[PDB]
Amino acid sequence: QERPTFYRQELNKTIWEVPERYQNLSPVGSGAYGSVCAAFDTKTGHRVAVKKLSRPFQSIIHAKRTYRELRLLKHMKHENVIGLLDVFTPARSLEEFNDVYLVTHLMGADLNNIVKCQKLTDDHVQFLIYQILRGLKYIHSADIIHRDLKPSNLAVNEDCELKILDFGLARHTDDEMTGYVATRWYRAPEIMLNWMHYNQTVDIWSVGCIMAELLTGRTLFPGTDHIDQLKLILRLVGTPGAELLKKISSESARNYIQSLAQMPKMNFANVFIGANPLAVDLLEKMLVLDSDKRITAAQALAHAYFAQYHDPDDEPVADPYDQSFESRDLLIDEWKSLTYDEVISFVPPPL
């Protein structure tokens, strides 16, 4: 293994310097802290997506996050999760190391694009939610939570295959959080304001939201702010008891909810008109306020809505992930050096 030959061009207003294996680069939109180009890879013969990070080491927080993202992508080997075909830098030494490029298989679109242009049949929804859940079982088994499941974060292709991306990258103390508007719509009530008490089933709430939207074409709870969001949610699931309501509300929001009459539980079969009774039933197990009674990814996969796909011996869990780095405090150049190590130690898929 010697250094490949690289070539340069300008895409999205920077110089992209990539191995000559990647041809026909085409900008196909932003990624998390980066931008993405589609390409053909002469080496595997696949169409791929290449993400170049935007100023990966511009602060300590950014550098760590660059490290976190690389470590996550390297760990994930699962058909319904984005993984790495390649990671490269044009740098020949740590002393010149500035840029990180990540490569995975090309997916044609995201579920935002699909929901906004096309009606989905109950069969589509079955296979799509199944893949989300299959992927999520695997992520959750490595003690990672996605935290931001929404349609734009679910990549799809022409054969209705799906991969989860942008898992576990953001934290709620991050500034200029992009995507925050859409993220609210899909977020579990218990973490809408603080994160002092939650579990991995925050992600299953988001799945419930996405599923409803794939079935109907419409965003289930498109709130304008924390009070509005809560009101929209309670209008469907019903106003809970006083102890639970306190766990999911600010004092202000709680006061707004209580200035209105108690809302009863709606029967989901009278909301989602025309739906598969089994689709309705699973939604009822996903969109529940009590997170200790919300269904897990593993349990959801055995739900009868997924009878045509479910298979316990073909729904794998992950190798154990070392998140000890998360507790560290390092300077830009130290996170950089760690990220460099990870770039250099990468071993590609066999193909």
Place this chain on the structure above:
Amino acid sequence: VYPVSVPYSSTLSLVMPS
């Protein structure tokens, strides 16, 4: 009320936006 796109009646493909 949120009627489904395609009412349920007792290989898959998707079209890309472009």
